[PDB]
């Protein structure tokens, strides 16, 4: 709980609301820059570096058998354990919602010179509709890793999408998918407890139960104060799921989740109401089948933040939050936040 300014270099324009700070062995990496990649970095993947409260951005290349992916703006990022990440969904700079899974993995490194491997993976069966503002998590159950995906929001289907409302977006159907990363099979499930869709939520992952918290519903235009839980099982045959509501929910839209300690997740403010900005932070501590929430001691916020209307950011991995404030007319003031 300590704020600090950040002096960025020259390429501040390459940062936009909706980026993703992927982490690989302490080396935080950038993704999702504004516009198509120029000739300074045809890959669009940058190596984050903060020293003496100063920020620098340098390019990075891929392997000889990689796939140059377009820079997305709202993907679903999740860790995996061979440490690699999963990218799904997103919004291309041409507003074309991608429905293809990309996998990041470091394949070579020598004196601060890395080389990624962006493989390509499609899906079969109950493939998800291309969307954004959603989340995906991995689940370990009985010596097996399975990916759980939750619905988000997307454009109108190819039938009712009229030109007068070509950019209208509604919440997707609240289903639950199981994606096998080894094979690429996605199976569609239906849960009676999940009544309506949800987007921009927070998905907390653990051994075998995913914790959904907060979000925003576009249909009813309401920010619920509920928290959900999805336990699953991986028997020798067909899987099994579950979902039950829980008391003590939190109403947050587009939060930023990070990890302070093992089984001790802290969360920062998001959006409380439409024109009201969340300020106080919460703390999530888990047991075995329990939860815990508590209003922490809010950090000393600056005057510019106490009146800014829009703010964004993401996680850094090392218990640190990188958020930004829009300027005027240089264009984005960037602050950092450390937890414990």
């Amino acid at each position: 709980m300590s704020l600090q300014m950040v002096t960025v270099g020259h390429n501040i324009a390459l940062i936009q609301p909706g980026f993703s700070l992927m982490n690989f062995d302490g080396q935080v990496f950038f993704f999702g820059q504004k516009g198509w990649p120029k000739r300074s970095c045809p890959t669009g993947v940058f190596h984050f570096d903060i020293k003496q409260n100063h920020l620098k951005l340098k390019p990075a290349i891929f392997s000889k058998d990689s796939c140059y992916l377009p820079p997305l703006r709202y993907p679903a990022t999740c860790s995996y354990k061979k440490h690699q990440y999963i990218i799904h969904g997103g919004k291309t700079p041409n507003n074309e919602l991608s429905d293809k899974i990309y996998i990041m993995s470091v394949a070579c490194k020598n004196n601060k010179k890395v080389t990624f491997r962006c493989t390509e993976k499609d899906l079969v069966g109950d493939v998800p509709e291309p969307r954004y503002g959603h989340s995906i998590d991995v689940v370990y159950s009985r010596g097996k890793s399975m990916g759980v995906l939750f619905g988000g929001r997307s454009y109108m289907p190819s039938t009712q999408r009229t030109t007068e409302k070509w950019n209208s977006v509604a919440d997707c159907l609240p289903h639950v998918f199981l994606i096998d990363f080894e094979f690429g099979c996605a199976t569609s499930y239906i849960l009676p407890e999940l009544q309506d869709g949800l987007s921009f939520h927070v998905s907390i992952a653990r051994n075998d139960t995913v914790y959904i918290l907060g979000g925003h519903s576009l249909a009813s235009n309401i920010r619920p104060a509920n928290l959900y839980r999805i336990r699953v099982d991986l028997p020798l045959g067909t899987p099994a799921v579950n979902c039950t509501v829980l008391p003590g929910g939190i109403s947050v839209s587009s939060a930023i989740l990070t990890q302070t300690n093992n089984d001790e997740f802290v969360i920062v403010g998001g959006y409380q109401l439409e024109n009201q900005k969340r300020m106080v932070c919460s703390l999530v501590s888990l047991g075995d089948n329990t939860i815990e929430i508590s209003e922490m001691e809010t950090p000393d916020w600056t005057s510019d933040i106490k009146h800014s209307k829009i703010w964004f950011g993401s996680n850094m991995g090392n218990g640190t939050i990188f958020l930004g404030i829009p300027g005027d007319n240089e264009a984005f003031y960037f602050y950092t936040l450390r937890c414990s």
Partner: protein
Amino acid sequence: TVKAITGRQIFQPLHALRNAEKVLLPGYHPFEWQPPLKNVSSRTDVGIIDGLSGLASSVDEYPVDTIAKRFRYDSALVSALMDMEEDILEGMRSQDLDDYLNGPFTVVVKESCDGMGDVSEKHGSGPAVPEKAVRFSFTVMRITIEHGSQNVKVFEEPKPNSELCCKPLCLMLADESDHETLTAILSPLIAEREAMKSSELTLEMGGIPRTFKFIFRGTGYDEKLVREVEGLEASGSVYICTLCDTTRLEASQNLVFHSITRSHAENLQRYEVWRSNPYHESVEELRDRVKGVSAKPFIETVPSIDALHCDIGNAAEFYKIFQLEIGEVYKHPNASKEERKRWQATLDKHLRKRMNLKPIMRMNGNFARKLMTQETVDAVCELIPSEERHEALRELMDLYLKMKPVWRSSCPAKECPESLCQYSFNSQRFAELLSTKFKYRYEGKITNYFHKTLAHVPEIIERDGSIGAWASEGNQSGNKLFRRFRKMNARQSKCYEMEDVLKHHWLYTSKYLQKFMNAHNA
């Protein structure tokens, strides 16, 4: 189109209008001065006289790179007086006066001169003219007649700040700071002015020969041009006021009691002392004796205050005070530039989200008027963590709003007499507030317009009658018309645009036509 479709002539062709224009333009009505004008021709048919006034343009002579067009001053006055015949007649008829009277009418005229900028140069053949443009105009303000032992106000302009009554006199293409070409062009005008300032005009309108006497006033001059023509240094000097001769420190200490002793002949005496040096003094001693005069004056101006630039300066100063108040400078006398940048950005964003305003480089006019509200003080106090600063700013803005209507109304003695009667006390409390609870900024220094507002406003109000009806904002409104006319109503040639724009802007400010457009109101 109308003639071909309707098969008749509802409108007249162009040549008819051209022939009719020759009546409103100068050089068409006879007149004569009973005291002959010294060094001025008595011919009465001159039109658009060249601006260079026959300046030598040989290769050996000093080079010339400017063009100018203008009228004869006296012919322009005659044309302006003949344009307002019906108004004077109706004023005499309404004030219970016989129309056939031919008393010695008295006319007061307001002069103005400003230097424009960013005027694009054109292609073609001719002299390499610069981009800065300068104009010079006048305005008939009020007329009285001596009936018995009184002075009946037969006519007064109802809108002394409208572009519809600012009649042009001269145009040129030169820098305002270029002191050589400026004087070389403005010498004949000042000569004619000083010549006719000791005569009387007679002419026959309505079948009766009349009598006129002029009393000119020069007030439409911004502070910079006043410093230039009157023979003073730049504005950043220590002798700030052009009405009193106090220094920076003595104007940052007293703030209250300052009379005016600064005439036009006094400047000539000051310059003569500075040139001859009869007491064989040093540089500093002689400068203190002359009170900072190092240039021979050439224009007799009225020691008044420009209301528009005063409002702009006050708004800018206040804005800076808001910036300093937000940053808590009185608590931390040290601050980096980046802190200033962030403070200004925060203030701009707050004013944008709470006052529907946008960031601007230079202080505007509408931004000034709209920034000076109680709700603005509230929005600014929404950022200050302290609470006594809040009340300080509240009292500051209250005093300023209490002092504002004195120097902004067309007649304070008949619209807001309470503010005028209570102006001295309010000004003293304002100065005391600045001295006590604003030491971090106003310790030993003060700008021009704070001194002007806190020192000489009551005296100017009680002497000249009103402030605001004598501002330079009419010339600025006319600058727009000049731009539009030069862009869309003139010959696109380097040696033909000046006379066309001058003629068109003269025709646009003729009340004779303004009466035809108001027919619906009959």
